[PDB]
């Protein structure tokens, strides 16, 4: 704590590289034990850890991604495999080092760490120097010394993953939640066509070759990049107002849901907006609005349930980019009960999602904020 | 297999000329007593060898057995292709300080294979679609990836030395 | 307007083949148009426009000794078009050879062969060919600002862009009122030696804008480059041939600054065969390149015509960094001497036809002596399609600070000599300073944390309640 | 068929023997299999506009949890995670 | 239609002929023509040809 010195990294680092594999057998099903581990997420499915070069990951070593990369670290969790990319850094001393406290230390450096910037490789710059270090406490309780921090560390790192866990668990109960309740209704629930609660509107595009079309203005451009999103209050082009002269865009109230209708969905879930301000949208989505005999958050919820048989009410329509067409998205009859049990029901429901995710009152903001805490305290780290 | 023919600077006439094999290690008084001498000690003619690498006709035969330790520590996939090693470096000292850096592709043959296996399993650049999966340019991607760094081809796989 | 123009020559030249076939007949015609008006503007600077076949040998030698083409009679491009949509083709066919008569003195010239007659039928060939001379003929050209069409039908999508052209020759030429100037190796177009007579008419001119380039169809467009924009002849020339296998001028002379752009790692299976090891060039260096990547070749070639004066300006991709103990001793004669002054970098793509960046060396036997890395990612403006422009009072900063060794951070700086032969050997490591990097307020973060606690568990207890079965 | 239509060994190598007598055998007469495609009406296929191959893709990939062991975790890991944050709330000293 | 294929001997039961550049269903059409009362035919397909 008081006697810091700035010992090189390489002092107390063995690094080596991977050994020969064939871990990669043209079929890597689930059903196999070892998870195919890489950058960014550590999980492709599963291969059999025998006879192929494993070097099955002994007790903690750390590894470095990439060629180009150079940013992403992991402790070995328990026993995994050597992915055609985890070259090991580990230690030679095994008394003073503890080398979850040095991948810890890996964050006291993304100073130097964030500007991958060329083609580049950088073995001796993790191969030299330096560290703070609380040598000369070695190996009598520098360990003993960095307890305090590492019990503070290792169950901050803790709560992080229990809290995607449990936020996973929170979706996995909601989203079973949403096919149990308020489906099936009778009786007798009337039943409505889609498009007869209120007029949807199509889309339009102006030119890109237009700029004053384009460059300025105030009316939310919304594309499908922007989608994907829920309470959308603004996009990211503010598209002239002018520019629906040549537009074929229709101005929509602001109580309205946004709808995509190319190419995300064929393989998933399909996205689902409340827009709040009059927008205007191109050709690659479509707004419904309702009128008069629900309410809104109802219609938006019950499309939200419905996704998983919408996608496969006009599912193909030929293998090309094309999609759910106007008619079969249009020609599905939909429950609508009776009045008080619009409101009520999705009082619930919409209370139940806007504690799960974005961004008012949600959880994974919530753990990002945890994470800028949690990383400002690592800065709070004994540097003194 | 890796020997020589080192005899002898007496008989510059070579007036039957002696010196049969030697292999590694080597002393001087077993070769000094097979091959004779000119009444004087002047001997190692290397005139004939079978080696991995090129050696003159006037190396001491310590550094023979100098060489013949950086030689024979390598392992076989190196051994094999000294010399094409040796077209990129320049002695077998200098590819013993980065022995350690060339990086051995024994399942890939040729560039298009490269940028596929750093495309493919690595994922280099990133993650890779599906759909996209199949158009990726590999042709253009291993002509920078040949003009970026250092690749060397041989029979066995591809050597990249890399920093 | 110049955009007018420039849009009439993207669209009335385009018909009806490939752009790297009628390329030749349309820039050959236009190249026609300038000889016969230059030669006209020539001959009438005293109104006897419309002229006669009495020329005159006696007089008729001394543009050929000044011009080095006495270039018609009333065979021009004026008595032409109008004469035009009549039998034959091969009035043209021989009035390009008699322009190339021409042997006294100082040729530079064999010249116009581009242009043939292909075609399927003969009179096919005669109504497009006197279509291509009718629309070269319809152009609101007028009188001096001639090349700029040329300078933009030369860019075609398929070539260094002017900007960075511009970066080349600003950075070579500073303090610099000496002679001579200027050689290029492998020039391509003479594009990038052009931006020299672009500002350096003002004072005098000094010598011949020299050149050497290897591919003979880039040869012909780039000796008609520097034709168009007014410049004089008789050493303002580019010679053919490869500058590796093939160097001159050796004899003549040690200059005072180059420019180049050479292309990525052609290959030269040249070591070691000829005497290259002991040339009068290579040997410095106590080695060749290596047998793919021909760069530091060029720059060895290039620090052998240099004086004691000038400063050399070259490029190279980013990755001739170490490759290899075969090119670290390349670099380590360059930095032995005081040879090497300032490296740049620069941003991807900023290219037709690549992907990668470049860097810039900028050589001197001129001494401080460090080695301002000076560099840049951005900006450098890459976000306009493609990654243009580089624009004026932009490069301005990049040269001010290359003015006297300044040291500005976000931005890069001088190193000590003793760093970088402690380090080995490297381009550009040093600065990259640290952007991106931000921290926040205990307190404010955690009251944000610990208030969206109170809410995050009521809503929980209250999903508690709505937990019914 | 989308699956199996063995497609995995490199490229798509190869729908093997006794693998594509699956394929023959459900085509003998004319039968209805789920995971698996069937007949159709000639009226349906009028009612459509007579596409190439909608039906029927039947249902994979969909699976629904139980209640109550979800909860019971929901709850244990909101008892671990509060005692873990007071004690971060404690560990908070500045 | 530039020679008589509307009124050709396999084309005309169709009613009209295959597109400018969509030759399948001309070979489809060519290959019912050729086809007994007993016999079947088995040909393939690009899947793009849906509704077009």
């Known amino acids: 704590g008081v006697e810091v010195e700035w010992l090189p990294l390489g002092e107390i680092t063995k690094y080596e590289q991977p050994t020969k594999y064939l871990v990669k057998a043209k079929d890597y099903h689930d059903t196999y034990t070892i998870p195919v581990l890489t950058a960014g997420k550590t999980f492709i499915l599963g291969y059999t850890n025998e006879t192929h070069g494993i070097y099955q990951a002994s007790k903690a070593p750390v590894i470095i991604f990439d060629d180009f990369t150079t940013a992403n670290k992991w402790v070995d969790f328990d026993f995994k495999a050597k992915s055609s990319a985890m070259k090991m850094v580990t230690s030679c001393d095994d008394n003073k080092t503890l080398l979850k406290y040095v991948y810890y230390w890996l964050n006291t450096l993304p100073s130097e760490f964030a500007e991958g910037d060329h083609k580049r490789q950088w073995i001796s710059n993790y191969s030299q120097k330096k560290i703070p270090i609380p040598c000369p406490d070695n190996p009598e309780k520098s360990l003993a010394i960095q307890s305090e921090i590492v019990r503070i560390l290792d169950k901050f790192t803790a709560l992080t993953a229990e809290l995607t866990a449990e936020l996973n668990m929170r979706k996995k109960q909601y989203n079973y939640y949403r096919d149990q309740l308020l489906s099936f209704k009778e009786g007798e629930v009337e039943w409505k066509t889609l498009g007869e609660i209120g007029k949807w509107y199509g889309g339009g595009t102006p030119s890109k070759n237009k700029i004053e079309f384009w460059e300025n203005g105030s009316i939310p451009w919304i594309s499908p990049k922007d989608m994907g999103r829920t309470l959308v209050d603004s996009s990211e082009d503010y598209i002239t107002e002018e520019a629906v002269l040549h537009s074929s865009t229709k101005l929509i109230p602001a109580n309205s849901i946004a709808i995509v209708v190319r190419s995300s969905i064929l393989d998933k879930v399909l996205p689902s907006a409340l827009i709040k301000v009059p927008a205007t949208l191109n050709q690659d989505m479509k707004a419904v609005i309702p009128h008069e005999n629900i309410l809104v958050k109802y219609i938006y919820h019950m499309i939200g349930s419905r996704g998983s048989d919408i996608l496969r009410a006009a599912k193909k329509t030929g293998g090309s980019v094309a999609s759910i067409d106007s008619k079969k998205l249009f020609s599905f009859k939909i429950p609508v009960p009776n009045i008080n049990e619009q409101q009520r029901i999705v009082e619930i429901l919409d209370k139940f999602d806007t504690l799960t995710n974005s961004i008012t009152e949600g959880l994974p903001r919530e753990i990002e904020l945890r994470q800028k805490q949690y990383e400002y305290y690592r800065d709070l780290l004994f540097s003194f | ?163 | 307007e110049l955009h007018r123009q420039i849009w009439q020559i993207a669209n009335d030249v385009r018909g009806s083949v490939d752009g790297w076939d009628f390329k030749q007949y349309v820039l050959g015609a236009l190249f026609y148009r300038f000889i016969s008006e230059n030669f006209s503007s020539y001959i009438e600077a005293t109104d006897d426009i419309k002229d006669d076949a009495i020329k005159t040998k006696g007089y008729f030698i001394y543009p050929s000794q000044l011009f080095c083409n006495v270039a018609a009679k009333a065979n021009t491009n004026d008595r032409l078009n109008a004469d035009l949509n009549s039998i034959f083709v091969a009035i043209e066919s021989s009035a390009y050879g008699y322009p190339s008569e021409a042997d006294i003195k100082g040729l530079f010239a064999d010249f116009d062969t581009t242009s043939n007659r292909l075609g399927n039928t003969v009179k096919d060939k005669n109504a497009r060919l006197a279509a291509v001379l009718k629309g070269v003929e319809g152009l609101k050209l007028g009188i001096d600002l001639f090349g700029d069409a040329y300078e933009f039908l030369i860019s075609n999508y398929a070539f260094t862009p002017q900007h960075v052209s511009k970066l080349i020759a600003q950075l070579a030429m500073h303090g610099q009122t000496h002679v001579n100037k200027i050689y290029d190796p492998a020039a391509g177009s003479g594009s990038l030696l052009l931006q020299a007579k672009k500002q350096f008419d003002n004072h005098i001119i000094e010598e011949g804008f020299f050149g050497q380039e290897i591919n003979h169809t880039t040869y012909n467009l780039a000796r008609m480059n520097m034709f168009l924009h007014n410049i004089n002849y008789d050493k303002f020339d580019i010679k053919l041939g490869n500058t590796l296998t093939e160097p001159h001028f050796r004899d003549e002379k040690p200059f005072d600054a180059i420019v180049s752009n050479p292309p990525y790692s052609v290959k030269w299976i040249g070591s070691d065969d000829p005497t290259l090891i002991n040339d009068e060039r290579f040997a410095p260096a106590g080695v060749l390149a290596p047998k793919s990547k021909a760069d530091f070749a060029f720059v060895l070639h290039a620090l052998n015509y240099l004086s004691a004066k000038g400063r050399a300006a070259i490029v190279c991709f980013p990755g001739i960094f170490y490759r290899g103990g075969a090119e670290q001793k390349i670099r380590q004669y360059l930095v032995d001497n005081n040879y090497v002054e300032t490296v740049i970098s620069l941003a991807p793509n900023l290219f037709f036809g690549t992907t990668i960046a470049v860097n810039i060396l900028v050589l001197s036997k001129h001494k401080t002596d460090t080695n301002v890395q000076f560099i840049d990612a951005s900006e450098l403006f890459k976000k306009e399609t493609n990654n243009n422009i580089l624009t004026d009072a932009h490069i301005e900063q990049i040269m001010q600070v290359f003015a006297s060794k300044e040291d500005v951070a976000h931005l890069a700086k001088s190193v000590a000599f003793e760093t970088v032969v402690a380090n080995d050997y490297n381009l550009s490591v040093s600065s990259y300073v640290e952007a991106k990097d931000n921290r926040e307020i205990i307190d404010i973060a955690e009251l944000n944390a610990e208030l969206k606690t109170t809410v995050s568990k009521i809503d929980q207890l209250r999903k508690d309640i709505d937990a019914i079965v």
């Open chain 2, 1 to 163: 297999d890796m020997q020589v023919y080192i005899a002898n600077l007496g008989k510059y006439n070579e007036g039957e000329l002696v010196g049969a094999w030697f292999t590694f290690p080597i002393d001087f008084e077993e070769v000094k007593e097979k091959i004779g001498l000119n009444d004087e000690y002047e001997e190692y003619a290397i005139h004939d060898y079978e080696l991995p690498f090129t050696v003159d006709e006037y190396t001491s035969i310590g550094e023979l057995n100098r060489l013949w330790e950086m030689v024979s520590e390598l392992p076989e996939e190196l051994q094999s292709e000294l010399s094409a090693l040796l077209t990129h470096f320049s002695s077998i000292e200098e590819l013993s300080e980065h022995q350690e850096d060339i990086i051995i592709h024994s399942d890939c043959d040729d560039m298009y294979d490269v940028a596929r296996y750093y495309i493919e399993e690595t994922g280099a650049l990133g993650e890779v679609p599906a759909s996209l999966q199949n158009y990726i340019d590999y042709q253009a991607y291993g002509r920078d990836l040949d003009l970026s760094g250092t690749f060397i081809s041989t029979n066995h796989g591809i050597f990249e030395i890399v920093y």
